[PDB]
Structure formats: structure tokens, C-alpha cells
Amino acid sequence: MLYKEPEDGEKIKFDKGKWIVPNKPVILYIEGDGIGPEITNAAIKVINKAVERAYGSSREIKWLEVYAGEKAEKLVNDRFPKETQEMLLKYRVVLKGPLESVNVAIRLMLDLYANIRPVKYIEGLESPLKHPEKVDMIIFRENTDDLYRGIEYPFNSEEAKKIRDFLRKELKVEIEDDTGIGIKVMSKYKTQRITRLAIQYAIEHKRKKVTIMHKGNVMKYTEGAFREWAYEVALKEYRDFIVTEEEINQGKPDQGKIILNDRIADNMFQQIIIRPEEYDIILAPNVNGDYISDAAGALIGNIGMLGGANIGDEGGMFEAIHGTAPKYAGKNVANPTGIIKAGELMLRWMGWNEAADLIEKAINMAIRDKKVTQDIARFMGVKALGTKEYADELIKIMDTI
Amino acid sequence: MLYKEPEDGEKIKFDKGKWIVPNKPVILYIEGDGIGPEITNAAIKVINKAVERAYGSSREIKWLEVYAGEKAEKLVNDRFPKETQEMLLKYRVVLKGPLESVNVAIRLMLDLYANIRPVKYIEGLESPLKHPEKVDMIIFRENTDDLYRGIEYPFNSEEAKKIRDFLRKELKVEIEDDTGIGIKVMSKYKTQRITRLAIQYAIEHKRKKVTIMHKGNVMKYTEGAFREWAYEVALKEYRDFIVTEEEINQGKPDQGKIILNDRIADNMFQQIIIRPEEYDIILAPNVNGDYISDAAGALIGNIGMLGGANIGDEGGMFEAIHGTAPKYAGKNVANPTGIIKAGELMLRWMGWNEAADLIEKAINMAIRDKKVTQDIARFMGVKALGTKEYADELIKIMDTI
């Protein structure tokens, strides 16, 4: 067999979207290509330290490396070996480094319909913004619906012609012939799924607000429906947990309750820059979430220091928001912060917030203390630490907090 | 006649979508609701001074007021009277204050398919950005195509059912029944005309770069087609005026030529925040143009101080990017900078660049000297100037440069 499973660990379980994590959970990891090996092993070491510091020996992640990408191609001549897939379907939780699609395959096989993008100010880090201090949001992007379904046809195709003829005769819709055509689809079920995940996360992590991003004023039956369905499932399934903005400024009490409001897409691309502190959890459809994530991440410096995840009803894949950077591979120079942040997010989803908070804290202290990798040092005029050395600094710091 | 037309003026002409402006052009204006009267009259006074200072008495705008909105309702009991429509179809160029729609009606009747959004840094204003200095761009948004055509249907409508049945049997596309449906259309012709306008503007006003905004990597036949069609008309109709980014990093020289490149939408939402100086003219389809405009304008912070326009092959409507501000109506408090900026844009389209430059410099100087209205004075600890007084200050300044 290609893998030796830890006989000391147990798979993480799920009952209805909720992660039931054993004290010795088996968690998979994929090194990744290029800088993958260096940053991922660094992440694992940092994570193990946070878990031991926070919980002592009462908890311990039983890591199981699986192969994918170049490493897999060189070892067994298959970039996504059958055994790797089997371990994924079995343990369903993986921390994976950058890969040169394997990412799409993992998301599809584990049905990780939600893309999670936390973006929080990191003290010490330069920002294009004069006041990034209060940036603390998390984007919940539905990642299987919308125009990204790929239902589209070229302007000069027979398919497009059939659509145009159909729209004209059956719907009396006027459309010229020199037109490319895409079908935007918005599912009630898909909208409810992501909405539930967002509210449940708010409850579990003491988040105070969820904002629905939409262009419902013009895209009435797709994004406007998204908004409607989101409020609908929130009020029907999380009644005594949430309070709508239409209730606050109406009389209802929001004391100890999560505020559920909504904003027009165009306004959000504006406010994220002018006053990003207004947002906590952002709930949005596929396309909007894609664009708002890019803007939000730019609010802080170096997007390569952010982590993210794709979550499903029974599984999750956590990764850094950056590429393989083949130029620095094996040079012990890459910044492991991003993949470490993916680990922090993973810790939070597992309910191990104490270990996650220790990592967040150690990073803030390391960066404020100018103990950073080259990508940052080059700007704060100081000697850079290597990948391994930087990870070790985070470790010694956690040992004192 | 309801309107006494200036017997001394001449109408602006159009040749291949190029403005042929007489020395005494008739230009229509609509005061607008709320603060409209105060700011539009101030703009007219500043525009006339700029024209007088730059060309003496050799040129003079023959303004002609037409009614729309609440003033029209009171005077002729019609929000958009027939007489107003007649003047618009005749003179085709109008400076319009904010209105509480008339905006859509003017755009349709004059086929003003291009939404123009200039946004450049103004010396002295608060900015969310640490470095807004080199922000100097103009967004050219196709404003009649894309999802905004409104071809959409509710998930439980018989129309939506007809569409899903069609796609299933004729296209063999699988789609659930609980889905709202929108149709994204992208026209080759609509894309070409907006592209021609953008390049022609770059040529006319010595602009050096045009960047196409798109998500063609995932929306290949709509936005990807937009990109392809834009490059096509550019290379085919403006060959000796432009050079592509691909050609430059291929060996070709860009000396004396406008640069034409493209960027994926998500990348632009990032770069517009971290380094907006990279953009000059942004060419984009309806939806992207909408979102990018919001993000771009947020870079300077004072949205109410921006001007904009809708241009067609034979006309133009210029307006400020703000509402009627009823709370400030008739209190001589409103900031007229946005509508003046719209007037500055109108002068550039007219080819009267000297007058436009005067307005631009005067505003810069006024702000740098802290001679501003309350919306700005509030943050610089100086006494605010009224609407009339601020306009008069710009006028005394223009008499000096």
C-alpha cells in the first residue's frame, strides 16, 4: 500500500454539517509543488506547537501525508493517485500546499461548495490603506452556482442560434445575431446551503453580523432571489439567533443576536475601500464573492499571507492564497504565513479556537517585531528570516503566550 | 414655444461619432431636483468663466434650460414633457443636475450607450489610500449590453419552466427546477462601438493606455468575446495608433503609440487598490464597468465631487455622481464640484481642452488652499464656504491662471 494510516487516530465525523472532532483527529496534508514542501512542513510544525501549547497532550493531530501533483507524478507516475483519492474520501479533511486540476477534483469529490476567505488586519504589515486596523471580515462565497456553471455558447454557434430563435418565438425576446450567450443560474437549495453554513459559523465563533452581497435591484430573479432565499432560511431556521436590520431600526432588540442585513454589490465595492470595518461576515453568490474576495484581500499587504478553504457538509480543504512560486522552491525563502493561516482557519472549523488564536497572536507579534521572511523584510529594511527560521520564531513565541 | 431657443447659437454636429463644435454652441441644461438649482447654476457660471478666460469672446456657450423632474411637474404637469424631448433630439447635448426615470429615458432616446467615469486624484482631499497621487483614470463602460438587458425570469414562472425544458431537450443541459434564470448577452457590435469611442478618446486627449476588463477565462463566450472583439476593431481600424502589450514584450516599440492590453476582472479589483496608477482608460462590459466604477471612485473618497457622462454617436448627457440631497436643498451648502466636473468632462468632449484645464486647475488650487464647502471643510478644520461663494472663488482663481 502507498499509505500507512495512523493506528492511533480517528477520522473527524459530521452529523449535520457540524464537525465532530476526536481528540486525536487524522488530518491529511499534501505538500504541494514548488515551495509547497517547505511551507507546509513549517505549517505542520507551527500547528503542532499551537495544539500542544493550548491543549497539552490531551489533543494531537495525527497527520497523514498523501501525494498529489509533481511529487505524485515522480513517485507513481500519476498526479492524483487512486489511493490518495481513497484517503480523501475517507478522512475528508486536508491541508494542502500550492499545486500547479487537482484542486477542482478535490472540491468535486468532497462537494466543498463553500469558498471561505478570511481577511483580517495584521499589525506591522504595510497596507495600501491609511487605516486597515479594523479590517476583520470573512467572505462566504457560494462556489458551485452562478455563471461559473459554464453554460455559455459562442455567438456564431448553432447552439446560440437555437437559443435566440427560442427566445424570440417562445418568449418574445428581441436579441441580435452577433451575440455571445451565457445562462446565469441561481439555485434556491444552493443559496440555502451556503446561508446555513454562514449563520452556523457566526453562532459558533461569536461573529456579530452577516451581510448579503447582491445586485438584486437589477438582477431581480437571480441575485435578488439569492437575497430573498437567504433571509427566508435565516428567519425560518435561525429565528431566535438572528435579527434583521429591518428589525433593529424598527424596534426589535439586537442584544446578544447576530445582525442579518444586505447591501447592493456596487455599494460594497465602494465601502470595502472607504470603510471596510462595516463588514463582518459577507454572504455572496459565486461571481460577486469572487470579485469581493480580490478587493478585500488587497486591503491588507501581501495577499500571499492569507489562507482560505473550501467547505462541504462533511469535509474541508485548506490552502494558502498563492501559487507554487517555483523560483524560490527549496531555497528556504518562501513566506509560510499563508499556509499557516489556512491551518489557523482549519483549527477554527475544528472548534479548536484556542490553538488558532495562539497562531494568530504569534504571527502578529512576529511581524510587529520585524521577525519576517524576505517578501516583507525587503520593505521594512531589516534582515529576513528563512522559512524554517521564521516558523521556529513563531514557535518560540507561542511558548511564551 | 415653451422654450425660447437662442437665435444666436448653433447646434453641435457629429461626424463619425466625432463632435464638430461651433463657436456659439447651444447646450441644454436641466437644473435637477433638490440641490440641483444651486449647483447647476454655479457650474454654468464657472464654465462660462473658463470659456471666457480661455477663448475671450471668440467662443460662448448658448445655454438653454429645459424642464424635467419636479420643476417640469409644476410648470407643465409632466415629468419629462414633449417639448423637452424635442429640444433634446434637436440639440443632443445636455448638462443635467440630479433627479429623484428621466435619466434612463434620455439615454435611450439619444442612444447614449457609453457611460464615462473619469476619476483622478485631487490635491488636498482626504483619501482612504495612503498614496492616491497617481490615480488618473477614465472608465469607459458599455452601458446597454450584458445582464443589465434584463432578460431574466423567476424560478417559479412559466417562462423559466419553458427555458429549462428547452435547454434540457435541445441542448442537453442539466438544470434543477428551483432556479432563477438570467440570460447574459454580449454583442459584437455593441462591444466594437464602445471600443472605438475609447481609443478615439485616447487619441484625441493624448491618453497612453487602454485596458480591457474581463473574466474571459471562465466566461469565454461573453466576456472573453468582448476582449477578442475589442482587440479586433483596434488592430483593424486603429493599427497605426496603437500597440498591444503582447507586441511590446515581443519586440515591437511603443513609442508614440497607445498601449492596448487586458486584465482579468479579479486581478483588477486587486490592483485598483494596491496600484491604481497602472490604469489609464479602462474598457469594460456593463456589469464589470459598474463594479469597477464604484471601486475606482472610492479611491478619492469624495464620490459627490466626481462627474460623469453617457455618450452616444450623436449626443451626450453630463452629470454629477451624487443625488439630490433634499436635506441641503436651497441652503447654499451643497458642493458644486461634481456637476462642475461633469461640465469639465463636457468641455473635453467638445475639444475645448483649454477651458476644461482651467476648471481642473482652479479646483485643485481652491482645495489646496482650503477654500471649500462644508463636506470638505469638516475634515480640515477650516470654515466652510457656501455653494455660491465656492463657485465665485474658483472664478477669481481662474482669472489668475
Residue numbers in the entry:
A (entry chain B), B (entry chain A): 1 to 100, 109 to 409
Give the published text.
The thermoacidophilic archaeon Sulfolobus tokodaii strain 7, which grows optimally at 75°C and pH 3, has an open reading frame ST2166 in the genome encoding hypothetical IDH. In this study, we expressed, purified, and determined the crystal structures of ST2166 in the apo and NADP+-bound forms at 2.0 Å and 2.4 Å resolutions, respectively, and discussed the mechanisms for cofactor recognition of prokaryotic NADP-IDHs.
ST2166 crystallized in a monoclinic crystal belonging to P21 that diffracted X-rays up to 2.0 Å resolution. The final model comprises 401 amino acid residues per subunit and 463 water molecules. Residues 101–108, part of the Cd loop and d helix (residues 97–118) equivalent to the phosphorylation loop in EcIDH, are disordered. In the structure of the apo form, putative isocitrate-binding residues (Ser109, Asn111, Arg115, Arg125, Arg149, Asp298, Tyr156, Lys223′, Asn225′, and Arg274′, the prime designates a residue from the adjacent subunit) involved in the binding of isocitrate in prokaryotic NADP-IDHs are exposed to the inner surface in the deep cleft of the active site. Therefore, it is probable that ST2166 has the same catalytic mechanism as proposed for other prokaryotic NADP-IDHs. The apo crystal of ST2166 was easily cracked upon soaking with citrate but not NADP+, suggesting that citrate mimicking the substrate isocitrate can bind to the opening active site of the enzyme and induce a large conformational change to break the crystal lattice. Therefore, binding of NADP+ is not necessary for a large domain movement in ST2166.
